[PDB]
Nucleic acid binder design. Structure first.
Ligand SMILES: [K+]
Ligand SMILES: [K+]
Ligand SMILES: [Mg+2]
Ligand SMILES: [Mg+2]
Length: 135
RNA sequence: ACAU
DNA sequence: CGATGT
């Protein structure tokens, strides 16, 4: 129904899918960019979406913030819930870096706790998520 | 079908 | 139009 403005919003941006993947997190109320991941040469949209949420979890935990996270990715929200990124991307030399980060993100989820609500951004009702890359 |  | 996902 109502946007929770006191929140963190994350999104992926890519050049190709699979392709170059980046992500960022922003203050939903103001759009202030709070973190930005250096581009990863080969990844999928959903791996980036997943990494972005997990990074948000770690960012908020480190700052003792109870803010929820918005993501527009049904897939990544479920992957974080499951603590398991069920990506189809081939594991080979050129995808090594993204798979390393995904493995480490899962590993972090399996060794830490959090109460952060991970909420679906309702793009159809509210427009594009505030962390969108505008491509 | 829905979410990207 | 193509791809990644439930
Ligand atoms: K975009
Ligand atoms: K499809
Ligand atoms: Mg998105
Ligand atoms: Mg977007």
């Amino acid at each position: 129904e109502e946007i929770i403005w006191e929140s963190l919003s994350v999104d992926v941006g890519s050049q190709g899918n699979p392709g170059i993947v980046e992500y960022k997190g922003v203050d939903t109320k103001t759009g202030e960019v709070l973190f930005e991941r250096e581009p990863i040469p080969i990844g999928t949209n959903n791996m980036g979406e997943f990494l972005a949420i997990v990074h948000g979890l770690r960012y908020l935990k480190e700052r003792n913030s109870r803010k929820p996270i918005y993501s527009d990715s049904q897939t990544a929200i479920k992957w974080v819930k499951d603590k398991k990124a069920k990506s189809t991307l081939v594991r080979n030399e050129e995808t090594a870096l993204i798979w390393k980060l995904v493995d480490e993100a899962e590993e972090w989820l399996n060794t830490h706790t959090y109460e952060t609500p991970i909420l679906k951004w309702q793009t159809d009702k509210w427009g594009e998520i505030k962390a969108d890359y505008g491509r």
